Amino acid sequence: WFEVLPGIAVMGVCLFIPGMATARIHRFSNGGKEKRVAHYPYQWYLMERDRRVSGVNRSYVSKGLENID
Amino acid sequence: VELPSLEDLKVQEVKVSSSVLKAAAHHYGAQCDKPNKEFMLCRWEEKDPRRCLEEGKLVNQCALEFFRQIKRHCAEPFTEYWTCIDYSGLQLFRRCRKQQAQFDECVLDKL
Amino acid sequence: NPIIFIIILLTIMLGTIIVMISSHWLLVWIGFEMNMLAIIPIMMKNHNPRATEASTKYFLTQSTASMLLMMAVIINLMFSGQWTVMKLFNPMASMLMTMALAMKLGMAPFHFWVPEVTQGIPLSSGLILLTWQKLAPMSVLYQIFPSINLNLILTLSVLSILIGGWGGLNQTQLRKIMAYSSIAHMGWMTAVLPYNPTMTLLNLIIYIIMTSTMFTMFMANSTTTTLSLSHTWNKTPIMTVLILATLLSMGGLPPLSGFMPKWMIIQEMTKNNSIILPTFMAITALLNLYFYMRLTYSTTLTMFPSTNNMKMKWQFPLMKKMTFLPTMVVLSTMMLPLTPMLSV
Amino acid sequence: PFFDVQKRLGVDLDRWMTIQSAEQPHKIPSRCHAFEKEWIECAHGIGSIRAEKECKIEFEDFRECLLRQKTMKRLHAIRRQREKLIKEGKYTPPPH
Amino acid sequence: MFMINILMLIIPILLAVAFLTLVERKVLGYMQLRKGPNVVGPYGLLQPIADAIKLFIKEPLRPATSSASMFILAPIMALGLALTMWIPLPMPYPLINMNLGVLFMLAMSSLAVYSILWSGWASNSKYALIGALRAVAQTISYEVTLAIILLSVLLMSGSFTLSTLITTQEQMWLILPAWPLAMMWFISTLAETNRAPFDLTEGESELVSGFNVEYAAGPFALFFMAEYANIIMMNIFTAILFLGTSHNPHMPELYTINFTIKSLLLTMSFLWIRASYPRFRYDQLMHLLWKNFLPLTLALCMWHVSLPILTSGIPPQ
Amino acid sequence: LLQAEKDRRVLQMLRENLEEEATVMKDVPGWKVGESVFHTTRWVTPMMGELYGLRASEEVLSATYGFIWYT
Amino acid sequence: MMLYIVFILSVIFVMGFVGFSSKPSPIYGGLGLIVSGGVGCGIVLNFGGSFLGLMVFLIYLGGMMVVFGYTTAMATEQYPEIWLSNKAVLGAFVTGLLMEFFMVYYVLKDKEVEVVFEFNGLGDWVIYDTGDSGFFSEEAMGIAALYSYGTWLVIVTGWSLLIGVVVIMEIT
Amino acid sequence: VAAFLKNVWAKEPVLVASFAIAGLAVILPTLSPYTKYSLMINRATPYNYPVPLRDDGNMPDVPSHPQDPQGPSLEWLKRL
Amino acid sequence: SMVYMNIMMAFTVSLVGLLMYRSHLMSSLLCLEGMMLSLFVMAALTILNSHFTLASMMPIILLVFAACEAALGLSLLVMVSNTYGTDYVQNLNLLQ
Amino acid sequence: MNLMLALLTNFTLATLLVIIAFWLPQLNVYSEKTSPYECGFDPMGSARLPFSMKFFLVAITFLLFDLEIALLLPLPWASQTANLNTMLTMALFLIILLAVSLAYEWTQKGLE
Ligand SMILES: CCCCCCCCCCCCCCCCCC(=O)OC[C@H](COP(=O)(O)OCCN)OC(=O)CCCCCCCCCCCCCCCCC
Ligand SMILES: CCCCCCCCCCCCCCCCCC(=O)OC[C@H](COP(=O)(O)OCCN)OC(=O)CCCCCCCCCCCCCCCCC
Secondary structure, three states: OOOHHHHHHHHOHHHHHHHHHHHHHHHHHOOOOOOOOOOOHHHHHHHHHHHHHOOOOOOOOOOOHHHHO | OOOOOOOOOOOOOOOOOHHHHHHOOOOOHHHOOOHHHHHHHOOOOOOOOOOOOOHHHHHHHHHHHHHHHHHHOOOHHHHHHHHHHOOOOOOOOOOOOOOHHHHOOOOOOOO | OHHHHHHHHHHHHHHHHHHHOOOOHHHHHHHOOHHHHOOOOOOOOOOOOOOHHHHHHHHOHHHHHHHHHHHHHHHHHHOOOOOOOOOOOOHHHHHHHHHHHOOOOOOOOOOOHHHHHHOOOOOOOOOOHHHOOOOOHHHOOOOOOOOOOOOHHHHHHHHHHHHHHHOOOOOOEHHHHHHOOOOHHHHHHHOOOOOOOOOOHHHHHHHHHHHHHHHHHHOOOOOEOOOOOOOOOOOOHHHHHHHHHHHHHHOOOOOOOOOHHHHHHHHHHOOOOOOHHHHHHHOOOOOOOOOOOOOHHHHOOOOOOOOOOOOOOOOOOOOOOOOOOOOOOOOOOOOOOOOOOOOO | OOOOHHHHOOOOOOOOOOOOOOOOOOOOOOOOHHHHHHHHOOOOOOOOOOHHHHOOOOOHHHHHHHOOHHHHHHHHOHHHHOOOOOOOOOOOOOOO | OOHHHHHHHHHHHHHHHHHHHOHHHHHHHHOOOOOOOOOOOOOOOOHHHHHHHOOOOOOOOOOOOOOOOOOOOHHHHHHHHHHHOOOOOOOOOOOOOOOOOHHHHHHHHOOOHHHHHHHHHHOOOOOOOOOOHHHHHHHHHOOOOOHHHHHHHHHHHOOOOOOHHHHOOOOOOOOOOOHHHHHHHHHHHHHHOOOOOOOOOOOOOOOOOOOOOOOOOOOHHHHHHHHHHHHOOOHHHHOOOOOOOOOOOOOOHHHHHHHHHHHHHHHHHHHHHHOOOOOOOOHHHHHOHHHHHHHHHHHHHHHHHHOOOOOOOOOOO | OOOOOOHHHHHHHHHHHHHHHHOOOOOOOOOOOOOOOOOOOOOOOOOHHHHOOOOOOOHHHHHHOOOOOOO | OOOOOOHHHHHHHHHHHHHHOOOOHHHOOHHHHHHHHHHHHHHHOOOOOOHHHHHHHHHHHHHHHHHHHHOOOOOOOOOOOOOOOOHHHHHHHHHHHOHHHHHHHHHOOOOOOOOOOOOOOOOOOOOOOOOOOOOOOOOOOOOOOOOOOOOHHHHHHHHHHHHHHHHHHOOO | OOOOOOOOOOOOOOHHHHHHHHOOOOOHHHOOOOOOOHHHHOOOOOOOOOOOOOOEOEOOOOOOOOOOOOOOOOOOOOOO | OHHHHOOOHHHOOOOHHHOOOOOOOHHHHHHHHOOOOOOHHHHHHHHHHOOOOOOOHHHHHHHHHHHHHHHHHHHHHHHHHHHOOOOOOOOOOOOO | OOOOOOOHHHHHHHHHHHHOOOOOOOOOOOOOOOOOOOOOOOOOOOOOOOOOHHHOHHHHHHHHHHHOOOOOOOOOOOOOOOOOHHHHHHHHHHHHHHHHHHHHHOOOOOOO
C-alpha cells in the first residue's frame, strides 16, 4: 500500500507533461493569449481580415480604439 | 463592363481589430438605422454592387463618428472591456458578463 | 415461408412502379435496383446446383447494366443540372444510356443473358416473372425517346430478329424456344420507337398476353419436345388443339390476332417513306415461324405415343386466368378498330 | 409509361430535389442561381421542340456559367499574351 | 515550434505505457498478498528500462513458412493508429481543432482490426489461422453496441466537436442523466480493446493467444507496446465524455492536474477486473451482444430522441 | 459595414487586374478591353481566376486553402 | 505545400485502381482499395465537405472492407501468392502506366497543342474557385442532411434494407 | 393475460425493459404542453439576415426604428 | 479541370475483361465494389463546389444500396464455393 | 498546413523502429537452423482452411445493421430545424425498421 505509490507517481507525471506543454505553446507562440479557433467559415473571415490590417502579418496583435483616434 | 475610377475608393477605413469591433457592436447597429438598413434595399432590392456606392460610404462615415464619440467621452472602461474579451477562445460573452455593467454604467446615462 | 413468399413477390411490382412514378433520376435508379435485389430468391426455391450457377450468371449481368445507368446520370448532372426524366442534353450520355439499358431488355448484342438464365432453372413454373423486367425499361424509353442517335437503336433492333431468329432452329428445349423469339418480339417494338412511340405499347400488351398463356399451357408436365408428344392421347386431346391455336396466332397469321400488331405497325413505318426497313424485317420473321411449324408437327399428328402409362386420374393444377386468354389472344382482330385509341 | 400519379393527388413524392433553384432550406443559392430562374422562364408553355432553336441564348450562357469554358480560355491565353515577355519588361503591376 | 510539440507528446507517453507494465503487477500483486518488484528497483521503479533492452538484443527470427510483405507491415499499422488517435483530444487545448472529431475516433478505432486479420493470416497455420478469424468476429460486433450509445449522448451534447463536450458539463458530471448507457459504454471498450474477461485475442486457454503466438521479441515488443496504448486512450476518452472536468481560461494549469488523476482511476479498473472474473467461452461472449446488450441500446436511443423534444430542451447549435 | 468593406476590395482587385492587363499587350489579333465572356450584361459574381489571375505564388494559396487545414 | 496538392493525390488514386484492376491474388486486392479509399478521401476532404468524406472510412472502409477480408479465408483458401511475381500481372501494369503519364504529358505542358487538347488546363488556383466566403451557418454541406422534405426517400431506403435481411435469412 | 406480464418477467427481464422504454416514448409527445414550445423556440433563432421592406400605401406596422413597440412577441424568453 | 480527367480515367476499373475474368471470381467482385468511389467521388466533386445545398444527400444514399447489393452478391459466391470449395469462373455447365 | 506533417512524423517514427529490430540487429547467417521448424508450434497441416457457415453469417448480419446507423447519424444535426413532427416521426421509423430485422432473424441465429 506504500511501494505502489512511486509506481503511480512516474506514470501520473507522464501525462502532466503534454497538457502543460501544448497549453504553453499556443499561449507562448501568440504572445500571452489563447489561440483563435475557427469552426465556421464566417469565423475565418474575421482573422483573414484582421491579418490584413493588424500591424504586419499576424492575427494575434491588436489595433485598439486609439489607432484610428 | 464599365467600372468606377480609382477615385470613389480609398475612404477613411476603420482600422480596428476583430474583438474591439465586436466589443461594442450591439449598441452600434440598433441606433443608427438610417444609412445601413436603406443600404440593404440598395443591395437586395436591386443587385449589381457597382451602382450602389453612395450608401456604402453613408454606413461607413457615420461609423467613423460612432467610435470618435466613444473615445472622447468614455474610453477608460471601454479599453478594459475588450481587453478581457480578447482573452481568447471563441470570444464568449459569459466570461466578461461581470465587467459589462462597468462599461454600461454611463453609456445609458452619460451619452 | 408462405407469407414471406408474397412480400418478396409483392415488392417486385413495387420496384417497377417507382420507375414509372418519378420525376427524378435518383428514384429511377432505386426502382430497378431493388428488382435486381428481389428476383434472386425466386431463382433459388428448390436449391439445385444449376440454379445457383444460373442466378449468378444472371446477377452480375444486371449489376453492370445497373451501374452504367448511374454513370449516365452523373454526366448530365454536369450539364445543366436538371434531373427531370427528359432528353439527356449530351450525345456522350445518351449513347452510354441506350446501350446500357439494352442489357436488361436484352437486345441482340448483350446476347446470352436470355438463354443461359431461362434454361435449366428448375423453376420452369414461372418465370412468367420475366415479363416485368421487359416492362420496366420500356417505361423508361418512353420519355428518353426524343434524344437518341437513330442509328444505334435500329442497329440493335435490325440485328435483333436476324439473330434471335437463327438462334433457335438448333433447339429442342422448349424453354430456350420460349427464350428465343423473346428477343425477336423485342425487335419489332424498338424498331418503331423513334417513329410515333405509341403503337409500340400495342405490341407489348399483345406480347404479355400471348406469352403468359403459353407458360400456363406448359404446366402439366411439359419439359422437352419429345415430352410434348406424349400428352395428346394421354392427358387431354383438347390440349393439343389449344396449343396449336396460340402458336399459329403468335406467328402472325391474319386469321388470328398476332397479325394485329404488324398490320398496324407498318401503317406507321411506311407513311414515313421508309420501305426497305420493314421489307427486311417482315421477311425476317418468316423463319421465326419455322420454330412453330415443326413444333406443331409434333403434337398434332399423333407422333408415337409409346411407353404405355395411363393417367386414369383427373388433373388438379391451378390454371389461373386461363379460360379468358385464348379468347382475347386469338379472336380479337375484328374487335380492335381502336385498341390504339384507348392506349394512346 | 409515365403514369404521373403525383400530379393528380397533390403529394410531392420527390420534385423538390430536382433543379438547382427550388427551395434552399436556409436560402443559400448556387453559383448559377440567376440563370436557372431566367432560363426556366423561357420555355414554360413552349413545347420544347421549338425551344431548342428559338430560345438558345438563355441556355448557352448558363452552360458557360457552370463550366466557365471560354472564361478559362480567355484567362489561359493571357498567360501566353505575356509571360514570354518575362525578360522583356512590364512586370505590371508592381507589388502591391 | 509546432514540430517540437509533436515530439513533446509521443515521447512522454511511451514512458506512461512502460510505467504501466510495472503498475500492472504491483496492483495485481497486493491483491494476492505479495510485494511488488522488490530487488532491482529499489522499489521497482527501474524495472522497465532493463526489461526493454533485453527484447532488442534477443534474436528476431522470422518463421520459415511465413509470407514477407504482410508480416512486417502489420506492426507498422499497429503503432500508426495507436499513436495517431492521441491527436484530436483536448487537455484542455487539443493539438488539432477538428470540426468533427468524435466521429474521427471511430474513423481510427475501426481499422485496428484490419491488422489482426493480417497477422493471423500473414505468418502461419491453425493456432493463429482460424484462431484469429474468431478474434476479428468479436471486435466487429462491438461497434454497433458502441456507435449507437456514442450517438445517444450527442443528442444531448448538441454537435460533433469536443469543446462543446466540456461546455455542456460545467454543472452536471453527465454520468447521472445517462447512467444505463454508461454501463454498456464500459463493457464495450472492455471487450473491444481485447481485455481480460472477454478474452480470446490475447488468449488464456483459448487460441493459446495465437495472435502473438509467433512474434519473437523484436517485432513483438511493439504489439504489446502499441496495444497498451489503446487502453489508456479509451480511458482518456471516457473521462472527457462522461466525467468531464471543469475548464478555467485564466488557469489552464489546474485543468490537467484534476484531469490526469481521473483517467488513471478508470485505468485501474482494467487491472482490477482481471483479478476477479473468469472468461466467457466464445458463444456466451457473443450470445450477450445481440440477445441481451443490443435491444436495450435501441430502447434508450428512442428515449433520447423524444426527451429533448418533450422537455423543450433542444441543445443549441 | 462588413459587406460594404468587402465589395470595395474586389473592384480594386478587378481594376488592377485589368488596367495592368490593358497595358500589357495591345495586339490587333488580341483582346478588346472591357468585354465580358457572356452575352448578358448583368453583374455575375467573379471567379478566383478573375480576382487572383496568373500570379498564383503564395497568398492565393492562403486565400483558397486557408479555412481548410486550420485556423 | 504546393498549389498542386490535389493533382498530386489523384494520380496515386488512378494508380491505386491499376493495382487491383489487373489480377492481384485477392488479398492484395484489399491493399488496392484501402490505399485508394484513403487517397480518394484525401480529395473529398477538400472543397468543404468533411462529413461526407469521413463517412467513406466508417461505412465503406470500416464496414465492407472487413467482410471482403473476412471472406477469402472461408472460400478461395488456396496457397496464396503475390502479384508482380508472375508474367500475366506485369504485362498489364505498364499498359496504362504510360497513359497515366502520357495523358498528363500533353494536356498542358505544351503552350496550347492545339485546339482539342487545351480547353481544360492544369491548375492553377481556380480548381476550388469558391470566392468569396459565406456565413456562420455551416460549410455547407452541413445543413444538407434532412429528415425534413425527403420522406419518400427514407421510407424506401429504410424498407429496401428490411427485405435485404430476409433474402439472406434464407438460402444460407 | 394478467399473469403473462409477471411470469415472463421471472424468466427474461431483458427485452421487457426494452419494450418499457420503447413504450412511454412514442406516447409522451402527444401529452405534455412542453412540446410546441420546442417548435416555438426553434422558430425564432435567426440564422440569416433580416432584409427590410418598403413603404407603399401600407405602412401596416413596424417603422424604421426597431426598438419601438413594433414587432411580435419573442421577448417572453428573457422572462423565461 | 484535370481533377475530372483524373478521375474519369479511373472509371476504367470496370474494364470488362477484368469484370468477370479470369478465375478466382473474388477478383471480379472486387472491382464491382471498387467501381464505386469512382461514382461516389465523381458526384461529390460536382455537388460541393456548385452549392446545390440539397443534392448532397444523394452521395450518402449512393453507398447504401451498393453495399447491400454487393453483400447479396457475396452471399451467392459462398454458395458457389459451398458446393465446390473453389470459385474458378471457368466453371460452366448450363450452356447457351 | 500541418495535418499532413502531423502524421507523417508519426508513421516515419513507426517505420523507423521496426527496421531497427527486424533489420539491423537481426541478420542470422550463423547456424540459424531455419529447417522445417517454425511451423507455428505444431507440425504439417495437410488440410486447407475449411468453410464454417456459422462464421459467415456474422459478417453479413453486421453489414446490414451497419448501414442504417449512417442514416441515423445526422440526428443531432436534425434538431435545429423547421417542422419537427416530421423529424420525430421519421426518426422513430428507422429504429423500428432496424428492430424488426432483429426479430425475424432472432427466430433463427444458430451457435454464432
Ligand atoms: C507504410 C508507410 C506508408 C504510408 C504512409 C501514409 C500513411 C497515412 C495514413 C493516415 C490516414 C489518416 C487519414 C485520416 C483522414 C481524416 C483527416 C480529417 O478528416 O481531418 C479532419 C479535418 C476535417 O476538416 P475540418 O474539421 O472541418 O477543419 C476545421 C476547419 N475549420 O481535415 C483537415 O483538417 C484537413 C483536411 C485535408 C488534410 C490533408 C488530407 C488528409 C489526408 C492526407 C493523407 C491521405 C490519406 C492517405 C491514405 C490513407 C491510408 C490509410
Ligand atoms: C420508466 C422510466 C424509464 C426506466 C429506466 C430504467 C433504467 C434501467 C436500466 C437497465 C439497463 C442497464 C443495465 C444493462 C443490462 C445488463 C446487461 C445484461 O443484461 O446482462 C445479462 C447477462 C445475461 O446472463 P443472465 O441473464 O443473468 O443468465 C445467466 C443466469 N444463470 O447477465 C449478466 O449479468 C452479465 C453481467 C455483465 C457481464 C460482464 C461482467 C464482466 C465484469 C463487468 C464489470 C463491470 C462493472 C461496472 C462497469 C463500470 C461502471 C462505471
